[PDB]
Amino acid sequence: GLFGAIAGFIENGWEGLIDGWYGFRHQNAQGEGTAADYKSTQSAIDQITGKLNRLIEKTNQQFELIDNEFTEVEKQIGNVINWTRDSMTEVWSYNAELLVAMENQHTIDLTDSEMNKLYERVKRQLRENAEEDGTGCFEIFHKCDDDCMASIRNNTYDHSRYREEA
Amino acid sequence: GLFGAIAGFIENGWEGLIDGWYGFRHQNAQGEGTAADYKSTQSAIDQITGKLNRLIEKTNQQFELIDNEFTEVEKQIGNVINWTRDSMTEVWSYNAELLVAMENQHTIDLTDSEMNKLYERVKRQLRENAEEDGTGCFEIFHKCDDDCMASIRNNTYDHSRYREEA
Amino acid sequence: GLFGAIAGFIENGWEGLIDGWYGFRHQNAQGEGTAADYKSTQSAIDQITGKLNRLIEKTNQQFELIDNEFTEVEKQIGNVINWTRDSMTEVWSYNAELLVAMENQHTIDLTDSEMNKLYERVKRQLRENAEEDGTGCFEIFHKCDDDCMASIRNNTYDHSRYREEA
Amino acid sequence: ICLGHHAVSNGTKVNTLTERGVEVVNATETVERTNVPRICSKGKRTVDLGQCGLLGTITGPPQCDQFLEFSADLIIERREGSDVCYPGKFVNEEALRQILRESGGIDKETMGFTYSGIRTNGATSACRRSGSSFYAEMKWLLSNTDNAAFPQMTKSYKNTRKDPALIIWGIHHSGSTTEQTKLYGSGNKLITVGSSNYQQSFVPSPGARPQVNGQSGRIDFHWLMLNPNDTVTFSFNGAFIAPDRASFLRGKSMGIQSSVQVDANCEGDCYHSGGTIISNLPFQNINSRAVGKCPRYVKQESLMLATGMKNVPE
Amino acid sequence: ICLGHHAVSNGTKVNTLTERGVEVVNATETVERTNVPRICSKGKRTVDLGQCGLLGTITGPPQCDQFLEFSADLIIERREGSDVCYPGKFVNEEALRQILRESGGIDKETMGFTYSGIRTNGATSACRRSGSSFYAEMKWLLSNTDNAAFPQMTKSYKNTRKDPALIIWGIHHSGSTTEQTKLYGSGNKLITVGSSNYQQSFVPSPGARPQVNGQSGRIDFHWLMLNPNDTVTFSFNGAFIAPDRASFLRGKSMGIQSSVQVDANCEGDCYHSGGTIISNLPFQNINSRAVGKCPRYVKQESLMLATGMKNVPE
Amino acid sequence: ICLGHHAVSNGTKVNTLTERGVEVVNATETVERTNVPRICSKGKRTVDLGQCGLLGTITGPPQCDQFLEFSADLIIERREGSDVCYPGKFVNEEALRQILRESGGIDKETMGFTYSGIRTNGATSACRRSGSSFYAEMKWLLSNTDNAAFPQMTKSYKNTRKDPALIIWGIHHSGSTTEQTKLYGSGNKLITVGSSNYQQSFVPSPGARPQVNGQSGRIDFHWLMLNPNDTVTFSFNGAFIAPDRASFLRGKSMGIQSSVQVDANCEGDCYHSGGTIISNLPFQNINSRAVGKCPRYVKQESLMLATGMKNVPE
Ligand SMILES: CC(=O)N[C@@H]1[C@@H](O)[C@H](O)[C@@H](CO)O[C@@H]1O
Ligand SMILES: CC(=O)N[C@@H]1[C@@H](O)[C@H](O)[C@@H](CO)O[C@@H]1O
Ligand SMILES: CC(=O)N[C@@H]1[C@@H](O)[C@H](O)[C@@H](CO)O[C@@H]1O
Ligand SMILES: CC(=O)N[C@@H]1[C@@H](O)[C@H](O)[C@@H](CO)O[C@H]1O
Ligand SMILES: CC(=O)N[C@@H]1[C@@H](O)[C@H](O)[C@@H](CO)O[C@H]1O
Ligand SMILES: CC(=O)N[C@@H]1[C@@H](O)[C@H](O)[C@@H](CO)O[C@H]1O
Ligand SMILES: CC(=O)N[C@@H]1[C@@H](O)[C@H](O)[C@@H](CO)O[C@H]1O
Ligand SMILES: CC(=O)N[C@@H]1[C@@H](O)[C@H](O)[C@@H](CO)O[C@H]1O
Ligand SMILES: CC(=O)N[C@@H]1[C@@H](O)[C@H](O)[C@@H](CO)O[C@H]1O
Ligand SMILES: OC[C@H]1O[C@@H](O)[C@@H](O)[C@@H](O)[C@@H]1O
Ligand SMILES: OC[C@H]1O[C@@H](O)[C@@H](O)[C@@H](O)[C@@H]1O
Ligand SMILES: OC[C@H]1O[C@@H](O)[C@@H](O)[C@@H](O)[C@@H]1O
Ligand SMILES: OC[C@H]1O[C@@H](O)[C@@H](O)[C@@H](O)[C@@H]1O
Ligand SMILES: OC[C@H]1O[C@@H](O)[C@@H](O)[C@@H](O)[C@@H]1O
Ligand SMILES: OC[C@H]1O[C@@H](O)[C@@H](O)[C@@H](O)[C@@H]1O
Ligand SMILES: OC[C@H]1O[C@@H](O)[C@@H](O)[C@@H](O)[C@@H]1O
Ligand SMILES: OC[C@H]1O[C@@H](O)[C@@H](O)[C@@H](O)[C@@H]1O
Numbered sequence A, B, C: 001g002l003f004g005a006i007a008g009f010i011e012n013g014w015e016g017l018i019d020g021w022y023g024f025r026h027q028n029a030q031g032e033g034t035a036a037d038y039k040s041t042q043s044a045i046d047q048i049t050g051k052l053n054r055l056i057e058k059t060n061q062q063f064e065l066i067d068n069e070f071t072e073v074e075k076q077i078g079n080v081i082n083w084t085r086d087s088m089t090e091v092w093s094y095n096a097e098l099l100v101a102m103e104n105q106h107t108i109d110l111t112d113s114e115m116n117k118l119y120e121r122v123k124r125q126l127r128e129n130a131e132e133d134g135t136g137c138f139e140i141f142h143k144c145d146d147d148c149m150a151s152i153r154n155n156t157y158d159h160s161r162y163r164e165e166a
Numbered sequence D, E, F: 001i002c003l004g005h006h007a008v009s010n011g012t013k014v015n016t017l018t019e020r021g022v023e024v025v026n027a028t029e030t031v032e033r034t035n036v037p038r039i040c041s042k043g044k045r046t047v048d049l050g051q052c053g054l055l056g057t058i059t060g061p062p063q064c065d066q067f068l069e070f071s072a073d074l075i076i077e078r079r080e081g082s083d084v085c086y087p088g089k090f091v092n093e094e095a096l097r098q099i100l101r102e103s104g105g106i107d108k109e110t111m112g113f114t115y116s117g118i119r120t121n122g123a124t125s126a127c128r129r130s131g132s133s134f135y136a137e138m139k140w141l142l143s144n145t146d147n148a149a150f151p152q153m154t155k156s157y158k159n160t161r162k163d164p165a166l167i168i169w170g171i172h173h174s175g176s177t178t179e180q181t182k183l184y185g186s187g188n189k190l191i192t193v194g195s196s197n198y199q200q201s202f203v204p205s206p207g208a209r210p211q212v213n214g215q216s217g218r219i220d221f222h223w224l225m226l227n228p229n230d231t232v233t234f235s236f237n238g239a240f241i242a243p244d245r246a247s248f249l250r251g252k253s254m255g256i257q258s259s260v261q262v263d264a265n266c267e268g269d270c271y272h273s274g275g276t277i278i279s280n281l282p283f284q285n286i287n288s289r290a291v292g293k294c295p296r297y298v299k300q301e302s303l304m305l306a307t308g309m310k311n312v313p314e
């Protein structure tokens, strides 16, 4: 992934996070907790649903047939016709494989981005109240209770209130 | 945008910044001010002008015509010809739409990057003399007068001189 | 480059780094030293070797020939055949140039990423024991001897041990 | 607090621009392979020609009495279809099939041809009907008495309608010069069809030939498309199988070849010999000769589109 | 201090790989739609065939006396063009048009054909000129006296030039066997044209036929391309319309069909029936049959290329 | 400590989506230009027709006695190849070449044709062999005594094998009506070939004609493909050049045209007139008419694929 986030400085993903695409997993004084982040998730989904839509379109182009399965057409014209059809088949097959191969590349990268987008959100948010370890976790330098951990999630965490106290 | 900059952690753009593509908007002791950044702007423009150029090329390929608008050619050969022409039309139309759709995706992302490129420039520049809020602003921890704000623009700001004093 | 790393906030590359693609160049108390980073390098190479592979495939599609170099076929059918062949030639030429032009764009960007990937690795690693100047160097706030500089390379540097002492 | 992303135990393999067979959290096909073994005709005006040959709908052989004037959205040819009675062939046939296939159907209207000094019966057991007869939209102009002499005859029609007209005519090829100077007069027989942008001439080729469907002679049909206000002229002296009626296309329609049953319960726009390719995907690997509004035919059996991040199991 | 980017009130919608109709700060067309209703011929050597039929420039009908030898870069056929005099047709015509269209023009040179015992007049009111005559680059070899007898005649030419030669010849189709055994001798008439890589034989088909432009007979022209140093041989005994001169291509040129006026003020390389597509864009939605150096024809009317960041209004 | 990337003094220029001629640390071609001036036939069963014309392998001219039944993977036609003896031509030839080119080779089997009251010699100095003879897989059915009379003769064959059969037959075109009523009887001659899905009829065209390879007459060969269990019927009365043997395709094979030597040391699958394009690259700029499994032909001479980061010299 171009952003070094997914399949990067975040080792693996969470198989228990069946709530969304991304999410927060904290470990405050009391107990832990793992909640998905609606914001980022929908952003990716929507976009990906985008491509899929872009790809499922109507070729309102109608082709009448020119061959004949019963009673074959003359041989000279026949080979020319098929020589043509195959050339076309060679082309579309090539296109078909490049589109999908290309699209996918982008798709995957598209997530890194979103994942990375979130991370950078949390960082800048916490200002100078937490440190960036490297595994994707933010060790908060102050008792961040459940109401607090979540405070960060719904983007309401006001570093200042706990600035000095950090 | 893959970089989460434009249409991201920078809410909207400035409709008054008709000077360049990107730029700095400060609010020092005295008065504010809004100046475009030539560096980044030209970088993007140039590149985008690049694609446009890449796309406006000469198909030195000349095709003689094989049909006939007055006096129609035989029917069998006629349908084959058109069956062919349409197949070609179906292809080019597909290409034409993928190129533009694909190019554009990239184009847009290309800006995020440049915008983000700038931001990261300003950050690393200011070293530990300012903080990163999140709206894309840098609250300088020291009277950064007009000569100072600008000092940052033209990349000459020497954090050290104001290091302690921050 | 979309990441602003290569050909960006890292001015030029090192012509003496013939060991790998990326690498570390330090200047500790004693002497300096320049060692390539296997991790990042292989990551890029592998991927790029990927495309090249994707591009070197077998068109198991066999076309019999329909023209005649000795004894030319009838004229009407002849022009149609060639009108077709050229149209196909126009197409493949277009594809051939877009693929390469497109692939390349991506390729280059692919490195920025990897380079940037590394840099962000070193940063987050050093935690708050070093500062980010901007030329791509990390001025360590503590005697980082050869064993130390390298300590960072092989990702084993434990900021804490030198935390206060920084 | 930490932030991450999801992942499943068994991902799905796909192909990237840089890798091959990478597991993503989830993908979806792109090349249709499912086929519906029926001709989904719901809502479409269908006409299964059956034992009638698409071309036979223009001449009039027994198999086609029920199709001399049909209206349709979807026409269907069956391998059992035949456009013939008396042994013979249709010169430049596939072209005619391509036209009628999209004609929307045909509409007959006499040629206004009346005759004198000759007979107009001319039937044959090869064209069995009501106990031995001839085509239908045709008339086998015959020389009155045996070994008689067919006149300098000339007949002409003028398409006075907005759209062009399909005009047919056949040339009879007796199984011998003896049968020829019997049915029609004697000597050289010349049939010349001419119009504004057309002008050929035909000559009978009477002589030994196999005996298909009881006859050794042959009647080959010819055809042109008469432009609006244009006039067609026939100049013959025998061996000419005259056209009693012209034909006009009703409008849009599509023709297919299938060996599969019609089904008015499902809907399709991409037909082919063995069914209908019902899918909204861009590519298909079912039949390269499918017609209508279809997905492009490719070689690959499957090209999977990632619809999720890369999958990283614990 | 803060840093941002620009934006406008009314952006421009475009299509991405992931979205549809996204506003960017600014885009630009990609599919040309503007057409110039004239044939931009500035700098090009033009020849508007007018009432002359491109093929008629080879035979020599009155409409083409002014085009029997022309030089050009751009040739132009008009719907009013006709390559005929005596009613008739050019066998395998479109092929010949395709050749002459790029011939750069033609250059005539006699065949060196002289005759004996026959006449070489043979004119017709159908080919009106100076008060009744015949083609021009032709010679209607005729039997001296009426009902006479055309000789075993044989004529042959040899292209002794670097480039191949275009050789023509016509077969006359009298309006009756009586007119035939009059103009030429009597009995079977056989015209056989042969060359290194060519060899056909033609036979007249005299008989009833409409009366176009005052004649009921027909003269159909035939043609082959004579290779360098090769020799063409004509073996006939009448009904043969001989070629007085051969033709050579001058070199490059393009042929188009238009119904629009010529204009030497503008320049174009992409012509088509109704104008010139003057544009540097890659795609066009104007005419799918445009020719020359054009932009590829597509279906879409507009495919907009973003030339700016995404637009985010305040 | 600092971290950077590599770079070289002289990079390699490539084209991006946004720039043109950017230096990257290293690239690699994509459009093959190297050609091997030989026909790399290693491992393939090859047959260089040489002076024998691919079509001549079906009729039997002297040049082809050694190729009347050949097996192969790769067939090769040489410009010096000829499929003829007696001057003449093969009607609808290129089609036949396209078939035999992939036939894998041919396998002969008699037609089982025996005759009566006529001769079966008919030879010619034009078809020199062992001192004057005729084709080989043919039989020039001739009228016993001079000016005699060829009988109503009829011969028929039935392909009783799994795969279809190639059936040939020729029509002789004497150099005069006199030579015709000599070799065969007198009067109209009609040759009618008929099968399930075939049915033509031919007529000789005897008359003046050049004298190629010592003869002024001409024998033109005709052909059809006989389906399994189907039966072909020949109905003639002279001027017919009968088929002594039928042909069957052995299976896969490819045919090429080259003027270059065969080489069993190298291996290729992409042949063309002047060599073999041996490469694993996707595009080639060598020959647009190359055949087999080749790289797509493009216009560009070089399309370089970056295989390294951007190059930034100190
Ligand atoms: C693609 C298609 O229409 N199928 C036909 C198939 O029925 C037949 O076996 C073969 C040879 O006739 O040609 C095609 O493969
Ligand atoms: C694309 C083009 O050349 N236009 C012609 C148009 O003039 C005509 O109405 C139609 C039927 O003849 O065929 C094409 O649409
Ligand atoms: C691409 C190819 O097969 N080469 C031929 C070349 O030999 C010849 O000079 C020309 C005209 O005959 O046609 C093609 O260019
Ligand atoms: C005359 C002939 O070769 N027929 C084949 C046909 O059997 C085949 O289905 C088609 C492609 O599928 O290619 C055609 O060339
Ligand atoms: C013989 C025939 O069908 N003519 C049409 C022609 O009118 C039309 O313009 C062209 C595509 O535009 O397709 C051709 O098939
Ligand atoms: C009949 C004719 O024009 N022959 C040319 C041939 O010489 C040329 O090689 C080919 C493309 O290379 O295009 C064909 O049209
Ligand atoms: C095995 C599975 O999970 N199936 C779902 C599928 O139903 C859904 O259409 C697609 C996109 O929403 O995501 C897949 O993962
Ligand atoms: C409405 C408008 O602003 N028009 C300009 C146009 O003149 C210019 O060619 C293009 C690229 O420079 O940018 C557009 O925004
Ligand atoms: C001039 C040079 O350095 N040549 C090498 C080449 O041998 C190698 O195949 C390619 C990819 O490994 O990288 C190139 O730089
Ligand atoms: O496979 C499609 C189809 O091909 C035809 O040629 C025959 O072989 C059929 O029996 C078969 O069903
Ligand atoms: O529309 C292009 C053109 O098409 C032709 O078929 C006729 O309908 C013309 O009158 C018309 O101008
Ligand atoms: O250039 C390829 C080939 O083209 C042919 O037309 C002739 O000109 C040959 O002499 C030449 O070798
Ligand atoms: O017609 C298609 C093809 O389908 C196959 O299943 C068989 O029934 C064949 O006999 C037939 O030819
Ligand atoms: O019955 C299935 C199929 O079998 C094949 O062998 C042929 O006989 C076809 O005509 C038939 O439709
Ligand atoms: O020729 C093109 C076409 O243009 C249209 O504008 C009309 O003038 C038609 O009569 C004509 O056929
Ligand atoms: O006058 C415009 C145009 O009108 C059409 O109806 C036809 O008559 C064309 O020949 C003519 O050019
Ligand atoms: O056949 C290909 C072509 O190759 C060239 O090198 C010359 O030898 C020509 O005479 C020949 O025609």
Ligand SMILES: OC[C@H]1O[C@@H](O)[C@@H](O)[C@@H](O)[C@@H]1O
Residues within 6 Å of the ligand: none
């Ligand atoms: O000898 C090379 C080449 O020269 C050309 O001029 C022709 O004569 C070819 O037949 C020959 O093969």
Ligand SMILES: OC[C@H]1O[C@H](O)[C@@H](O)[C@@H](O)[C@@H]1O
Residues within 6 Å of the ligand: none
């Ligand atoms: O397309 C409508 C109209 O187009 C042209 O004017 C001609 O083809 C007319 O016959 C037709 O009615």
Ligand SMILES: OC[C@H]1O[C@H](O)[C@@H](O)[C@@H](O)[C@@H]1O
Residues within 6 Å of the ligand: D274
């Ligand atoms: O039996 C599977 C399949 O085989 C071939 O493709 C044809 O005979 C088809 O008609 C048939 O359905």
Ligand SMILES: OC[C@H]1O[C@H](O)[C@@H](O)[C@@H](O)[C@@H]1O
Residues within 6 Å of the ligand: none
């Ligand atoms: O292309 C130049 C040259 O090519 C080949 O040698 C032949 O076609 C020659 O007739 C021609 O002069």
Ligand SMILES: OC[C@H]1O[C@H](O)[C@@H](O)[C@@H](O)[C@@H]1O
Residues within 6 Å of the ligand: E274
């Ligand atoms: O009138 C608009 C346009 O309509 C049709 O496309 C044709 O008749 C054209 O010639 C004409 O210019």
Ligand SMILES: OC[C@H]1O[C@H](O)[C@@H](O)[C@@H](O)[C@@H]1O
Residues within 6 Å of the ligand: none
């Ligand atoms: O493909 C194998 C098989 O396919 C169909 O059934 C027919 O074409 C058979 O003649 C052939 O043996």
Ligand SMILES: OC[C@H]1O[C@H](O)[C@@H](O)[C@@H](O)[C@@H]1O
Residues within 6 Å of the ligand: F274
């Ligand atoms: O001589 C270079 C090259 O020129 C032309 O392409 C042909 O004559 C080739 O056969 C020859 O190899």
